[PDB]
Structure formats: C-alpha cells, structure tokens
C-alpha cells in the first residue's frame, strides 16, 4: 500500500460536490476525484453546484422523436437473467411519457428504495417495459461550457481529430428516456473507456458497480452461469444482455456497491468498472464516453467482442504513439507486457 491503495481502501462509491471553480475544468476535476481514490469503486457521483444548469426547461421536447425505442423482454430466474431488446416503431416523447405514466407501466408504490429494489428484481421478467435508449442528440444549450457532454474536450477527441471517424454514443452524445423497470445490463464501456451520465429530469436511476480491481471475478462468475454465451464470445457481457441480481453477487463473494442517481446529478464510470442498473420511472439521461491518459493502458488491453460486426473498435495506435512513444515500437511488436494497477492514479 503506497497511499494509492491507501485511498478509498474499501473501494466504495464516493460522491463529490465541486464548487463552480472546481467544476469549471472537467478533465482536472476527474484527475482530482481519482486522487481521492474515486476510481477504485468504478463509479462515482458528482453533484454540480446548485446554480449550474445545462438547459432552461424541458417543456419543449414532447415533440422529440425516439427513432428506435425497444421493449425489454427478460427471461431468467434465481437472480440470473438475459434481456432481449425488441425494436418498436418510432415515437415521440409525448407518446412515450404517456405509456410510461400509464397505470400499466407506472412505478409501483413503495416506502424505501430497498423495497423498490426488491420489486424490481421480483418483477423484471413481467410486463416488459419500453426504453427509448441510445438516441442521438443533446439537451445541453450551446452556451454551457461546463461539463458539456457534447464537448468534454478529453484526449478521446484524438480519434475524431486524427481520422474524422465518429462513433455515435462514444464520441457523440446519447439520450435515454426510461420508465419503471427499464434497465441496463452488466458491462464496462466500449474499449473500457470512462462514461459520463447526467440525469436531466424525472425519477431516479439506481446503479450497481463492481470495483475494477475485481472485474475479472465478475467475468468468471458470468462465464460460469452462461457457459454457452461465454464460448461463443469471450466478451459476451459486451452484448449488454446479462442481468445478475445483487443477491447473486453477494452469494458468490463478488464485491459491489449500489447508488441511486437523482435528477440533476452526474454519474461517472471508470475504465473496466462493471456496472448495471434500472430506472425508477419516467426520466431522461444523457451520456457519452470520454478518455484520460490513465485509460490508454486499459484501451490497449480491452477484451473485445468479435462475434458481432458493428461493435465499437478504436485503434490505440494514435494514443500509444502520442503518449507512450518509448513503448510504441515494443507494443507494435506485441511485446508490451505492462500490468495495470487499478488503484494507481496518474502521477
């Protein structure tokens, strides 16, 4: 333990409340929370200063179109499930909100989150909800320069910069319109990048996270529960179809933490941090991926899915050449055997 492993030793989800001054520089603040060990949990919450807002009001989006909403059919039992996303016909937020608030797909009543959580894991395979996920677009106003998911200005911009290649949702923003019981399966980001998520408005979004330090253990458990999927694609979790309840993680000794995101709050996932969750009710979130110098090693060692052809793939060549010149030759010759230290920040 060299102060690196001494910071956030429990590797739990930390929450930060930056001042408008600290909040101003995105990349700087990220390096700051990592200095406090936030990356150890694989997920961190950041509450923006109360006087900050990305948009005046959202009373003008009932017209926004959700080109490919999906109905989430889930099959499984005893805390292990597989989610099949069926594409539905395009619809407007108005139509979505209508259904979301209907008593058919409405959020059930409950006292404490614990109860809402139990209801989620108890009925996720019933009454398949609709999720207006992965919608190209932003809700930020052109003038917002602080934490603008549309232009974070991280080194991830080097992909577009160097090749002009655009990867929707990765180096471009996505909007997610959810309803009660809509969920996102266990996964790390594409190329094990970082992700940023802002809940514009609506009901909460709860998250589960596994410390990057224990990610391989989660994979081994997953492989064992879905042997078939594992042999057809080592990185089958990237298909984003696998759901595992916290009781199952608990039963097999896989450390994890949970947190609930409220409207107006940001969530940050770190490289190789597995996460999953579900929406409490009607809500809208925006997110994209971003990179840091620390991500580079992760990107070089990311295990990718090949069984599918349309998966996100990023050439690490431009990053190794620019930030690891002394190792470019070695890496290009597949002799770079660097070992990643998940607790180490970026000295």
């Amino acid at each position: 333990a060299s102060e690196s492993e001494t910071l956030n030793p429990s590797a739990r989800i930390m929450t930060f409340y930056p001042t408008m001054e600290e909040f101003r520089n995105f990349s700087r603040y990220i390096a700051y929370i990592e200095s406090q060990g936030a990356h150890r949990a694989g997920l961190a919450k950041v509450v923006p200063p109360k006087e900050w807002k990305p948009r005046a009001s959202y009373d003008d989006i009932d017209d926004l179109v959700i080109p490919a909403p999906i109905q989430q059919l889930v099959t499984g039992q005893s805390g292990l499930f597989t989610q099949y996303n069926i594409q539905k016909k395009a619809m407007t937020v108005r139509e979505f909100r209508k259904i979301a608030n209907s008593d058919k797909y409405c959020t059930p009543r409950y006292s404490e989150f614990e109860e809402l959580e139990r209801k989620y894991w108890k009925n996720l395979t019933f009454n398949p909800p609709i999720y207006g996920a992965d919608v190209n677009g932003t809700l930020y106003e052109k003038h917002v320069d602080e934490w603008n998911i549309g232009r974070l200005r991280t080194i991830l911009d080097l992909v577009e910069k160097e090749s002009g290649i655009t990867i929707e949702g990765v180096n471009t923003p996505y909007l997610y319109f959810g309803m009660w019981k809509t969920s996102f399966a266990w996964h790390t980001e594409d190329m094990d990048l970082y992700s940023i998520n802002y809940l514009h408005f609506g009901e909460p979004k709860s998250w589960y996270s596994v410390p990057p330090e224990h990610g391989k253990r989660l994979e081994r458990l997953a492989k064992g529960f879905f042997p078939g999927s594992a042999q057809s694609c080592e990185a089958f979790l990237r298909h984003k179809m696998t759901l595992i309840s916290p009781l199952m993680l608990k039963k097999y000794g896989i450390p994890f933490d949970k947190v609930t995101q409220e409207a107006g709050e940001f969530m940050i996932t770190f490289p190789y941090g597995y996460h999953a969750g579900f929406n409490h009710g009607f809500n809208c979130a925006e997110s994209t991926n971003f990179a840091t110098r620390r991500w580079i090693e992760y990107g070089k060692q990311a295990v990718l899915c090949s069984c599918r052809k349309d998966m996100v793939k990023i050439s690490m060549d431009v990053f190794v050449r620019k930030f690891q010149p002394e190792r470019y030759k070695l890496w290009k010759a597949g002799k770079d055997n660097t070992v990643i230290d998940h607790t180490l920040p970026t000295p």
């Binding site: 992965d134 090749s163 949702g169 996505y174 996100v312």
Partner: peptide
C-alpha cells in the same frame, strides 16, 4: 482483416418482432 480498426455504434443489439 474483415472489419475497420476504428468504428461502430454504442447502441447494442436490436432484435425485431
């Protein structure tokens, strides 16, 4: 090869009825 070294979409699988 058989695919680009850089590209793709974040939107996961999409099955249709």
């Amino acid at each position: 090869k058989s695919a680009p070294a850089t590209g793709g979409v974040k939107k996961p699988h999409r099955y249709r009825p």
